[PDB]
Structures are given as structure tokens and as C-alpha cells.
Design a protein around this ligand. Structure first.
Ligand SMILES: C[C@H](Nc1ncnc(N)c1C#N)c1nc2ccc(F)cc2n1-c1cccc(S(C)(=O)=O)c1
Length: 823
């Protein structure tokens, strides 16, 4: 009975049933509350399509992938057992229309199927074969049994004019001179509604006050999701913070005694918002407070002015609203309501500390015919789920829009939707439930949901309880088959993690350890490494037996395991191993975010028939400074190409490294073409994200020319890497204009203005990136970089003049920054 809950725990990596670190029942309330959305989505999903999870897209096929087809014909090799016939098919042919031309077509080597009522041009696997120029090897197979996916069954607030007040009894710490004072903030979003300090006392390991801080706000004017934020300052400096939701999950005003264990500091940072209290009771500072059945209820213009308003609606998400701007938006409430783009600013004009105002806000929300009718803008939808909005109804209108996204687009934004849960005031939310049901409706979304949630639970004390509850809610309806898969995957990576860590210690980069490594690996082949497991970063591929011959450790400072496995699938029509790098040392939650932004940029370019052959490899964080990376085959760093032929830099090297790895001049030109696309993409992307000034041992190239940056987890400068050896391949010497170098420039400018057609989307994604995954780089100035980088305000023409100049700044500096590193 209860051994299943213990199964869920080791799967989750946290004990959801625990109550050692709560001061109310919100987490347990959210467990009981999430049962409905689960049972709905479980009961409504097609068990057969759920079992085969056909990964399909409704987008148009781009112009570049069109001209790779031979007129309404595609070859599709079907396999029986030994023999295999090869059919002509029309892009618009359904999987059924190919079958006649029950059983089901499965892709060879993978747990991936081609089924359902969409044309074969709308399966991603077929767009993957078309992109790389490969042949669609399917295999007539029996459908997988839906039995296998079975699930194991289971006084009014507005009548109170009293000013709100909180008694600060004191703070205690078991171990620490200066003086110290508590600051108590009533908050809503990042907005501070009302502030009150204590008098400064001496900072001993206990400090009492017994003081009532009376706030100017009234109990009736407190809005749901209002945080009492408590902060300890000691010329001042913030040392410890904690929060407490003044209005609870039942809409009740929060009463009584609280001893809250606080978080230390090492600033817009998503950790500063959490309702969680420090679980480390022994080392942590605590504060002691007192609050004293009060429940919350629930319910044309001048020409010049129109222009001023439209000018405000037209500005970027990061452009600050003045009081003048706000008062304008609010007064012309119903004109602002006509423009979906105004909504973020409009709701940033609301005075949330004033009952009557919020009342009118909810009135205005009831008349949102234009919003509901508008075309989904993820950019706009994202802004309403960020840290500037803590109102359920505002945030629910955002989650409304997300409902319309096809599964393929959920996948695109899943990581950042998951991180958006860090900005929710309450454990139960539209957003959490949206993630929950979309995860249970689709095994691919659910797979990655599981890892994304698990990444955070494993290493964020600030949010591991919330995500833990949401994860359990997923696990209790995913199906017995997936529970078994996750259990496998967790077991496998726990083994491999141990091996990785133990081996890191054994050096201060010797090759005598190589045998000690291959020892542990060989001696883990039998117990308890299973004979198959899903690759967590690509749930298509199952991996079976190791290849202990090929497994190595790097001449490095962090000794990552280069591992390779055999594919457990016999129908796999290839000899390629599945490669995985296990690394400790870097925090890969930053690499996940950057890589996901990269895939987002690709799909953007897809809307403008552009392709820049980015290589955003799989990467999954799994624990404290530890995770896996997909191995990109046939690849090497730009530094090693220099260190082999020089040991100290030279221009030529790259080109005859390419040419030597190109078998026929035929292909070699396909490589240098690939290099111009790849190079431009990574220059565009890295300038925008402000991670372009990289040290060439962090940039890689395949044997087919594809360039790609790596290790994103990390004087005079350079906006991106466009070194002479890159230029050499293009065919330009100091100052020239090669046929390819102009094409590079051409692509860069096309791609750069292409990103700018989604400024808002990128701004919001980038802001969220910094706030939820990168604790160090979180200030207005840090965030506003991407405004500058995207040259907000500037016209397309000036923007091209801006980017091309940047290219020149790199040209101007050649090898400087690269060399300057060695010092
Ligand atoms: C730096 C490179 N990174 C990647 N390599 C392949 N695929 C990737 N996705 C990455 C990344 N990121 C790398 N990481 C390694 C970890 C262990 C190991 F034994 C080797 C590793 N390499 C690597 C790969 C090729 C060549 C070299 S080398 C000979 O040191 O220049 C190192």
C-alpha cells in the first residue's frame, strides 16, 4: 500500500508527505487539489494515441526543406524482417494512405511511430530525415498495448477598516560586530505596497523587540497573493530574507504565531519570492512574529492622448512606465483593453493595494472579448506569467492562451513554463495544472516535464517542495509503463553519477586511471545496470550495453565521463553508438536554458525560411553541479585543431583540417557551406544573449563543417568569436570581400533582423532566463543588455549597419582576446 508512495519518493528525489518544513497545509491542499485535473486528463486521453505519441506539427514545411523534395514524391523504406520494399509517397499522404499503398509503422531504431490523421509532411521525424538528407526507414510493427499505460486507481475582509499590523518578537541565530534591524514589506509582485522598519538593535545571537509595526494599508485593501516579506539588514546590507503569504490558499487572512527559518544571501532573483522556509533548522537564522475568521470574497478620447497611449503600448517590455504613463493607461482603461499588447502595461498600472481598484480591474477582466479573440502571442503570454504579475486572474488569462498551443509548441517552451512556476504566489495554479494535464496527455511532454521538474527538486531548496507536489501529481497518472521507465532511468544515472564523482577525486590527467575507470564500468555491467534504458535527453533512443573500449575521461580540470552505449533496439539499421558525457563541476541548469533558447531561435528562423544549422545538443541537469550531455559525433574543439598543427596560433589550419576530413572535394564544399551557416547563427545568437566573447577551447566543429559553442555554464573585448581562422575558411585575408564572406554577412543580417521581429519574445525569455536560472546576473542593467543587443527603437536599416559594424570590431582585433587568455 505505502510502498508505492516510497517508490514515488525515490523517483521524485524528495519526500512529499513530509511536514518537517511547513507552517500550514498548502502543500497537502495542493496534493488533494491536483487530483481532479489528473483524473480529467487521464480519463479523456486517447489510450492508443497516448501509447504511440505521434510527434506531429501543424506548421508549414519551410522553403529550404521544400526544394529538397523531388516533386510530390518521397521514398519510404518499409521493413518486414529480412526483406524491405521501398515506396513512393506524396507529402500529403496519411500513414494509412501509405499502408494500402491491424499493424502500425514504427521508425527504425526508436520508440517512435508514424500514426494518426495528419500528412507525412507533418511528422517531425520525416522533417528530420529531409533536413539532414536521410531515408525514412520504418518497420511494420504491432501496436504497443494500451494495457501497459494503465493507471493505478485511487467575517468578511472587506468589512475590516483596521490597519494591518505585524508584531516582530525577535530573531534568533545559533551562531553569528554591527547593529541590525528587521524590515517588513507588504508586497505584490516586485511592487512594494507598504514598508516599515524596526529600530536598530545590537546584533547578538538573539535580538528581541516585541514591537508592533503598524502598516498604512488596511486589511480590506490586502489583495490575494500579498506577501509579507521580512528582511534583515545590518551602510546597510541585506543578510536574510523570508516571506509569508498574508492571505492563504482558502482566501483566509493568516493569523497567529510563526517562527520562520530564513534564507541567507551570498537583485531580481526568483528565489527571493518563495513561500518556502529554510529546512536547515540548525544553522539558519529565524524570525518570530505574531499576527492578530476574516475571509476574502470574490466578485472617445483626444488625438494627442491617443498617440501618447499608443506610443506607450508600442514600447518594449523592459521600458519603464512613469506615473504619468500609468495614470494614462488606467484612466483610458477601456481603450487600452482593445489592444492585447497593452495588457502587461495596463496591469502594471493597477494599484493593487486598493480594494476598489482591484474590483474595477476584475470588472475590466470580465469584458475581454478582444483578448479571447486575439491570435496567440507567446511573447505577450509569457510577460503575464513573469515576476511582475501575482494576480490569479491576470495570470489565468495568460494560461488561457497557452491552452491553444499544439503539443509541438509546448515542447518548445516547456522548460520556461516550468520555471514560470517559480513566480506563482501559490502551489496550486492555472500554470501548474496546465503543465500537469499537457504532461499526462503526451508522453514526450511528460518525459521532459519529469526531468525538468526533477532537475529543480534535486538542487533548489527554495522550490523543491512545490515542484515535488506537481511531479507526484504527474507520476500518479502517467502510467505503469512510464513509472517503470523513469525508475530505470533514475537507477542508471545514479550508478553512472557515482562512478563519475569517485573518479574525479583520483587525480590532482593520468592514463593509469583509464583502467581503474574501465574497471568500475566493467564491474557495473552485470549489477545493476539494466539491459536497456531510455536516453533522458532523447526519449526516442533506448540504450543497452556499454562500449567500455570507447569510454574515457578528459585531460581536464573536471574529469567528465565520455561514455558510449549500444542501442538496445535490434531493428536499429545502423552501427552508431549512443554517446553521453557525464560531468560534475558546472551547473547545467544554465546550459539547459541557453540551449532551449537556441532551439527557440531555430524555430523563429523557420518562420522566415531561414536555417543556420545550429547544434543545440541535448543536456539535462540531474543534481548539484551534475548532469548529462549528448555527444555530438565526429567533432573537435577549435583549440585542439590549433594545438595539433602549431601547439601560438595560425590561420590556415582549420581549412586543411576540414579538407583532410573531407573524403571527396564534392563533400568538402558542403562542409565550408555548412560552416558559413553555422558560424553566422552562433554569432547572431551569442551577440543577442551576450555570451559571444568565448575562449576558443569552448567552440567545436564537426567533420562535416558544423560549428557549435559549448560549456555555456560559465580588459578589452570582442562581441563574438569571428577569428581569422574562421575568416580564412571563408576566404578573406585581413581586408577582402570573399563570395562566401559576403554570404556570411548576408545570412547574419537576415538572421539578426529575423530575431528582431520577435524582440518582445526574446526580451521576456532572456529576463526570465536571468531571474530563474542565473543567480549572479540579475539586475536591471544585466537584463537591459538584450534591449541594446537587439537595438530596440532603431529601424531595420540602422540595425544592419549596427550588426555589420560588430563584425568589423572582431575583424579589427583578430587574435588579441584569444591570446590574452593565457595570462
Ligand atoms: C569539450 C568536448 N565537448 C563535447 N564533446 C562532444 N559533444 C558535446 N556535446 C560536447 C559538449 N558540450 C569534450 N567533452 C569531453 C568529455 C570527456 C572526454 F573524454 C572528452 C570530451 N570532449 C572532447 C571531445 C572531442 C575532443 C576532445 S580533445 C581531444 O580534448 O580536444 C575533447
Amino acid at each position: 500500500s505505502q510502498a508505492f508512495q516510497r517508490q514515488l519518493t525515490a523517483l521524485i528525489g524528495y519526500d512529499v508527505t513530509d511536514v518537517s518544513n511547513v507552517h500550514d497545509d498548502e502543500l497537502e491542499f495542493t496534493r488533494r487539489g491536483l487530483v481532479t485535473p489528473r483524473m480529467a486528463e487521464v480519463a479523456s486521453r486517447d489510450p492508443k494515441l497516448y501509447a504511440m505519441h505521434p510527434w506531429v506539427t501543424s506548421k508549414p514545411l519551410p522553403e529550404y526543406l521544400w526544394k529538397k523534395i523531388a516533386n510530390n514524391c518521397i521514398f519510404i523504406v518499409i521493413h518486414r524482417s529480412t526483406t524491405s520494399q521501398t515506396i513512393k509517397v506524396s507529402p500529403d499522404d496519411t500513414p494509412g494512405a501509405i499502408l494500402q499503398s491491424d499493424f502500425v509503422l514504427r521508425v527504425c531504431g526508436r520508440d517512435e511511430y508514424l500514426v494518426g490523421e495528419t500528412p507525412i509532411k507533418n511528422f517531425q521525424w520525416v522533417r528530420h530525415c529531409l533536413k539532414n538528407g536521410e531515408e525514412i526507414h520504418v518497420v511494420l510493427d504491432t501496436p504497443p498495448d494500451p494495457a501497459l499505460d494503465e493507471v493505478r486507481k485511487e467575517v468578511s475582509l472587506w468589512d475590516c477598516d483596521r490597519k494591518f499590523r505585524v508584531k516582530i518578537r525577535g530573531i534568533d541565530i545559533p551562531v553569528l560586530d554591527l547593529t541590525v534591524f528587521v524590515e517588513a514589506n507588504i508586497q505584490h509582485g516586485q511592487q512594494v505596497l507598504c514598508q516599515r522598519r524596526t529600530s536598530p538593535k545590537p546584533f547578538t545571537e538573539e535580538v528581541l523587540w516585541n514591537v508592533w509595526l503598524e502598516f498604512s494599508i488596511k486589511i480590506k485593501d490586502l489583495p490575494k497573493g500579498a506577501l509579507l516579506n521580512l528582511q534583515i539588514y545590518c551602510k546597510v546590507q541585506l543578510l536574510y530574507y523570508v516571506n509569508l503569504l498574508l492571505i492563504d490558499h482558502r482566501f483566509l487572512l493568516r493569523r497567529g504565531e510563526y517562527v520562520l527559518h530564513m534564507w541567507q544571501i551570498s537583485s531580481f532573483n526568483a528565489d527571493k519570492l518563495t513561500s518556502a522556509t529554510n529546512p536547515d533548522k540548525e544553522n539558519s537564522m529565524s524570525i518570530s512574529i505574531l499576527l492578530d475568521p476574516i475571509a476574502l470574497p470574490k466578485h472617445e478620447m483626444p488625438n494627442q492622448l491617443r498617440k501618447q497611449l499608443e506610443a506607450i503600448i508600442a514600447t518594449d517590455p523592459l521600458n519603464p512606465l512613469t506615473a504619468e504613463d500609468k495614470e494614462l493607461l488606467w484612466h483610458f482603461r477601456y481603450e487600452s483593453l482593445k489592444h492585447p499588447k497593452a495588457y502587461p502595461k495596463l496591469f502594471s498600472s493597477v494599484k493593487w493595494g486598493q480594494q476598489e481598484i482591484v474590483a474595477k480591474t476584475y470588472q475590466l477582466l470580465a469584458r475581454r472579448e478582444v483578448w479571447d479573440q486575439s491570435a496567440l502571442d507567446v511573447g505577450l503570454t509569457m510577460q503575464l506569467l513573469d515576476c511582475n504579475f501575482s494576480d490569479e486572474n491576470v495570470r489565468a488569462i495568460a494560461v488561457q492562451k497557452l491552452e491553444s498551443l499544439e503539443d509541438d509548441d509546448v515542447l518548445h517552451y516547456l522548460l520556461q513554463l516550468v520555471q514560470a512556476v517559480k513566480f506563482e504566489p501559490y502551489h496550486d495554479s492555472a500554470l501548474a495544472r496546465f503543465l500537469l494535464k499537457r504532461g499526462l496527455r503526451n508522453k514526450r511532454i511528460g518525459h521532459f516535464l519529469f526531468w525538468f521538474l526533477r532537475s529543480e527538486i534535486a538542487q533548489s531548496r527554495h522550490y523543491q517542495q512545490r515542484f515535488a507536489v506537481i511531479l507526484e501529481a504527474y507520476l500518479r497518472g502517467c502510467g505503469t509503463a512510464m513509472l517503470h521507465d523513469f525508475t530505470q532511468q533514475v537507477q542508471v544515472i545514479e550508478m553512472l553519477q557515482k562512478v563519475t564523482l569517485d573518479i574525479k577525486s583520483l587525480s590532482a590527467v593520468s592514463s593509469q586511471v583509464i583502467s581503474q575507470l574501465k574497471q568500475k564500468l566493467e564491474n557495473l555491467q552485470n549489477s545493476q545496470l539494466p539491459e536497456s534504458f531510455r536516453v533522458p535527453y532523447d526519449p526516442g533512443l533506448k540504450a543497452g550495453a556499454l562500449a567500455i573500449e570507447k569510454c574515457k575521461v578528459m585531460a581536464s580540470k573536471k574529469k567528465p565521463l565520455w561514455l558510449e552505449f549500444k542501442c538496445a533496439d535490434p531493428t536499429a539499421l545502423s552501427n552508431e553508438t549512443i554517446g553521453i558525457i557525464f560531468k560534475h563541476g558546472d551547473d547545467l541548469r544554465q546550459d539547459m536554458l541557453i540551449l532551449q533558447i537556441l532551439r527557440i531561435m531555430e524555430s523563429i528562423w523557420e518562420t522566415e525560411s531561414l536555417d543556420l544549422c545550429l547544434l543545440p545538443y541535448g543536456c539535462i541537469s540531474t543534481g548539484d553541479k551534475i548532469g548529462m550531455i549528448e555527444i555530438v559525433k565526429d567533432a573537435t574543439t577549435i583549440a585542439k585543431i590549433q594545438q595539433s598543427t602549431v601547439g601560438a596560433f595560425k590561420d590556415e589550419v582549420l581549412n586543411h583540417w576540414l579538407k583532410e576530413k573531407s573524403p571527396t572535394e564534392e563533400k568538402f564544399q558542403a562542409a565550408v557551406e555548412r560552416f558559413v551557416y553555422s558560424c553566422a547563427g552562433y554569432c547572431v545568437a551569442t551577440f543577442v544573449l551576450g555570451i559571444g566573447d568565448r575562449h576558443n577551447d569552448n567552440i567545436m566543429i564537426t567533420e562535416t563543417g558544423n560549428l557549435f559553442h559549448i560549456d555555456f555554464g560559465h580588459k578589452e573585448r570582442v562581441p563574438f568569436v569571428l577569428t581569422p581562422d574562421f575568416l580564412f575558411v571563408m576566404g578573406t585575408s585581413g581586408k577582402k570581400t570573399s563570395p562566401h564572406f559576403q554570404k556570411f554577412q548576408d545570412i547574419c543580417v537576415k538572421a539578426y533582423l529575423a530575431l528582431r521581429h520577435h524582440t518582445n519574445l526574446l526580451i521576456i525569455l532572456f529576463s526570465m532566463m536571468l531571474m530563474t536560472g542565473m543567480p549572479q546576473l540579475t539586475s536591471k542593467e544585466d537584463i537591459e543588455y538584450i534591449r541594446d543587443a537587439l537595438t530596440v527603437g532603431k529601424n531595420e536599416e540602422d540595425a544592419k549597419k549596427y550588426f555589420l559594424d560588430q563584425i568589423e570590431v572582431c575583424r579589427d582585433k583578430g587574435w588579441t582576446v584569444q591570446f590574452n587568455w593565457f595570462l
